[PDB]
Design a protein around this ligand. Structure first.
Ligand code: CL
Ligand code: CL
Ligand code: NA
Ligand code: NA
Lengths: 134, 159, 152, 134
């Protein structure tokens, strides 16, 4: 899996996700990447989210939409909603992975519960930040 | 808030012991070029929807990341690709699952969003919809890389 | 306080009383089947599985026998089941050679590493685990064919 | 589309959904029925839901899970959450249809915004209710 999230100068949010799945997968199987609210979600009222990791668990957890609902309904900060989903709710179901999220105020989060996640972010007009490890 | 982009190329058991700094820099260089393209587009006033589409098209093209070129192999030594895109303004989405003859599944996902009353299409029908709207038919052998084939052999027994 | 609810589809529902009574009669029989199972201590999972199996068998309702026609005069069926006790789920999409998609959805929940399978692979997964192959002609009804021509 | 939700004597919730799709649909299109959080959702701690209606709208709005999230995080009752999803949020995206829902406390709702929904419900050991029109 790969993905991207963005907030533009007009205040609009968007998310996208693309994958080839897991090595040695049976054909005609579908994980989180193409499923709205599992692998991918965006709403101008809350957040844009793109996910990576165990497909069966990100679906059962509705991981991407759960971030949006915790913020919009629950009044959690992006930081608290990402900690709740990635560090507590996914591992409790045996889900390993992470995601990238940007909220309507331009706060950014790149949580993961794995050894690593290939990742990068940057503000318009600023130097980018890159990472691999924790 | 400031305009901003984040990207990822997957989470998992990535370890410091596994790579040289030069091998790490190949991943860092790829992630940097893609976020830079995204930052330049945002600064020029382009939409979040067009920025996330272009960023995922680049991650698909990059053979280091498991989407598009560089996809993992299935049990049958094939490739089967899935993608989704969502617009936070209109709350429209488009998605394809189980496609093997489209070079860039995120572009086929964006066509489903923009040029149909549907959110999700699957398999040969998803491909036929995209081909009818000028998208190219490719052979799935275009996605194949030596590194991902060696990962397939390490994860199984030979018959 | 055990309880069941069922639906047979929402939309623009013309009909005579005898026509409407066939729907009321089918809804009453299936909901009473589920109520008796719940009273006997059968699980919520086994109750919704059986209720949707009966809605699939009933030609009045758009699932299994009585499925609507596609633009190509074919049938394509989809189903999902979720167990609130384990949070496990199973689903099939775009299947035409399985009589009861909800039973195939349950097999995926119980035996697949994945939530969802599609098309010929979903069918072959179910056949490999003892489920029977059928021709999609078995789903065809005169009423749904007439509804296709009316839509055209 | 058809569907069923149940609460058993042990407090377990479950949901199931099955369909033939829309009359005259493009083959290879997928609506809400087989997608977790769109056409089907169950959680012992919250609610069981099965949906019927415009597939692309039930997907974009994650209608089945949104019932669970409005109750868990928003403080809405089952009846309030059902009113808000089916009569407000689905029409705002051009969607028509309805759903059936049971909460872990045994409250039951069968909302719809259409001319009719074939439906029935009953407590164990009681006489059932049926309906077609509003
Ligand atoms: Cl009469
Ligand atoms: Cl009535
Ligand atoms: Na790639
Ligand atoms: Na039927």
């Amino acid at each position: 899996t790969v993905g991207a999230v963005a907030l533009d100068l007009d205040g609009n949010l968007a998310a996208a996700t693309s994958t080839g799945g897991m090595t040695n997968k049976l054909p005609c199987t579908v994980g989180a990447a193409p499923l709205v609210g599992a692998g991918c979600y965006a709403n101008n009222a809350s957040v844009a989210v793109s996910c990576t990791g165990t497909g069966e668990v990100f679906i059962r957890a509705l991981a991407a939409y759960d971030i949006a609902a915790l913020m919009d309904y629950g009044g959690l900060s992006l930081a608290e909603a990402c900690e709740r989903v990635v560090m507590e709710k996914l591992p409790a179901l045996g889900g390993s992975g992470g995601l990238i999220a940007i909220d309507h105020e331009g706060n950014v989060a790149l949580p993961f519960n794995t050894e690593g996640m290939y990742r990068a972010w940057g503000y318009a007009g600023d130097t980018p930040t890159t990472g691999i490890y924790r | 808030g400031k305009a901003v982009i984040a990207i990822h190329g997957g989470a998992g058991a990535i370890s410091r012991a596994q790579m040289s700094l030069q091998q790490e820099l190949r991943y860092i260089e790829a992630l940097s070029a893609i976020v830079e393209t995204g930052q330049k587009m945002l600064e020029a006033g382009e939409s979040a929807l067009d920025v996330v589409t272009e960023a995922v098209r680049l991650l698909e093209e990059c053979p280091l990341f498991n989407a598009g070129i560089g996809a993992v192999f299935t049990r049958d030594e094939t490739h089967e690709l899935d993608a989704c895109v969502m617009d936070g303004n209109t709350l429209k989405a488009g998605a394809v699952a189980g496609v093997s003859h489209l070079r860039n599944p995120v572009l086929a996902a964006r066509l489903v969003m923009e040029q149909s009353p549907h959110v999700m299409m699957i398999g040969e029908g998803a491909e036929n919809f995209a081909f009818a709207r000028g998208m190219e038919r490719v052979s799935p052998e275009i996605f194949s890389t030596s590194l991902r084939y060696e990962q397939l052999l390490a994860a199984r027994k030979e018959g």
